[PDB]
Amino acid sequence: DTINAKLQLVMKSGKYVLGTQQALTTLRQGRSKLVVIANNCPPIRRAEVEYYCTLSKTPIHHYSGNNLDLGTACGKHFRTCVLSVTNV
């Protein structure tokens, strides 16, 4: 619940990004502060993101919820798998 409240606060006042491609772009540019991934993810698809995070030394959080759950926590009506926070 703490992570959901924190993400709600970030969305209210911050800068974030949804999508694997955009998250990878933020990692490449070095403008990322934290990456959150849902649990129902394909192994290779999640492995590429985890490898990039490890290479860039960026902290990574595992949501332990569905992508629909992550979308609802984000307060949207669509499913999201990956989230990248650029400014808190």
């Binding site: 290779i44 492995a47 590429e48 490898y51």
Partner: peptide, 30 residues
């Protein structure tokens, strides 16, 4: 093109995981 890219990435990442696991086992053994 997407299938080729997926195969390339999968090959590289699997080989890295295998190397790390084997090195860890040998370092625990020695």
């Amino acid at each position: 093109h997407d299938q080729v890219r997926d195969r390339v990435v999968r090959a590289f990442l699997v080989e890295e995981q295998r190397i790390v696991k084997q090195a860890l086992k040998e370092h625990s053994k020695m």
